[PDB]
Nucleic acid binder design. Structure first.
Lengths: 155, 132
RNA sequence: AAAAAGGGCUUCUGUCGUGAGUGGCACACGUAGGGCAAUUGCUCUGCGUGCGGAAUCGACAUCAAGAGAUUUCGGAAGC
RNA sequence: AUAUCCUUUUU
């Protein structure tokens, strides 16, 4: 149950936004893009990939885990730059579940990847970090969001 | 009124003008006439991965005119194939630069000949950074 | 380098749009170039931001494209 | 929770 207010909270007890990027997060409203096609329950969100890994490199590595139906490596539509994340769909529940447990720590290039389900249409209130908020984050810029998988809530 | 479109469509059937994709606009046909006369040249802005689309500018063109050439090209190509129209380039040029073979294009009001780009040459993109 | 005295509160365009908090148009401010008049003033076109700066930490961050945030105080309007 | 508070005066 996503809620941008407690994203900056150490344990969900915050009542005031940690920064302006949470104000931006909750004020703004988000609807999934046009490129979001396929089943959400069977889509894997893989991130932190190297900017120079192509679609086949991911294709073989994540077809190691089962049967793929479609693999998209999100690029910058005007310049080509890979945005360093990719959504992969899996026929049958087996593959996505297996590639959720034994998935973090399968370094593909000189960059270690992160694996989670796609939330978008399954997590109420999800605001991607482009429109403020989001999940994860490096605790060095100043804006991080707890409550996810990389950085859970410190009770 | 749209009486010009009938004459336009009749003209595009000329074999010397079959290259143009119907919707020509006076600027693009002027560019073709110039490249016939030798003061216009094309240039390729290359997507780092995937494809490479070429654009055409005048011999006196500055980085501004290459900027609007990119402005014109991909925008048409969107609904030529059926892509995304409302594309915000207040982002794109705020973050990504233009790169010659080697150097990167920084001074926006300087002609491409000073930066050394010429016909059939290719350019690319950097995320800028490198300070702020 | 150190010492003393200190450091009021809010807000910062409209319009139609949803692959678009990021588009189109309009408006406001800044900038560059051209023309006009009495060292300065007036007008036209493109670009940048939506109030504008400084310091700091990133910009190699988790959602089909979107890198900002903390501290600080200058301007205008109202308390 | 990672990093910087600002003004005036004296020296």
């Amino acid at each position: 149950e996503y809620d941008p207010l407690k994203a900056g909270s150490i344990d969900g007890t915050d009542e005031d936004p940690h920064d302006r990027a949470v104000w931006r997060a909750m004020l703004a409203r988000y609807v999934p893009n046009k490129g979001v096609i396929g089943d959400p329950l069977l889509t894997l969100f893989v991130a932190r990939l190297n900017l120079q890994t192509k679609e086949d490199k991911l294709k073989e590595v994540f077809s190691r885990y089962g049967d793929i139906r479609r693999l998209r490596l999100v690029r910058d539509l005007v310049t080509g730059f890979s945005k360093g994340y990719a959504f992969i769909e899996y026929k049958e529940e087996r593959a996505v579940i297996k590639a959720y447990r034994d998935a973090d720590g399968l370094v593909i290039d000189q960059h270690e990847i992160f694996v989670d389900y796609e939330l978008e249409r399954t997590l109420k209130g999800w605001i991607p970090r482009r429109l403020g908020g989001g999940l994860g984050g490096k605790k060095e810029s100043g804006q991080l969001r707890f409550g996810g998988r990389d950085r859970p809530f410190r009770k | 009124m749209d009486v010009f479109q009938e004459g336009l469509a009749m003209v595009v059937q000329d074999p010397l003008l079959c290259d143009l994709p119907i919707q020509v606009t006076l600027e693009e046909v002027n560019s073709q006439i110039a490249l016939e006369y030798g003061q216009a040249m094309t240039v390729r802005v290359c997507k780092m991965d995937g494809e490479v689309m070429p654009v055409v500018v005048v011999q006196s063109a500055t980085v501004l005119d290459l900027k609007k050439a990119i402005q014109r090209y991909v925008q048409l190509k969107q609904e030529r194939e059926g892509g995304i129209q409302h594309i915000s380039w207040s982002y794109v040029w705020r973050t990504y630069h233009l790169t010659s073979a080697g150097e990167k294009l920084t001074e926006d009001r300087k002609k491409l000949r000073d930066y050394g780009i010429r016909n059939r040459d290719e350019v690319s993109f950097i995320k800028k950074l490198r300070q702020k």
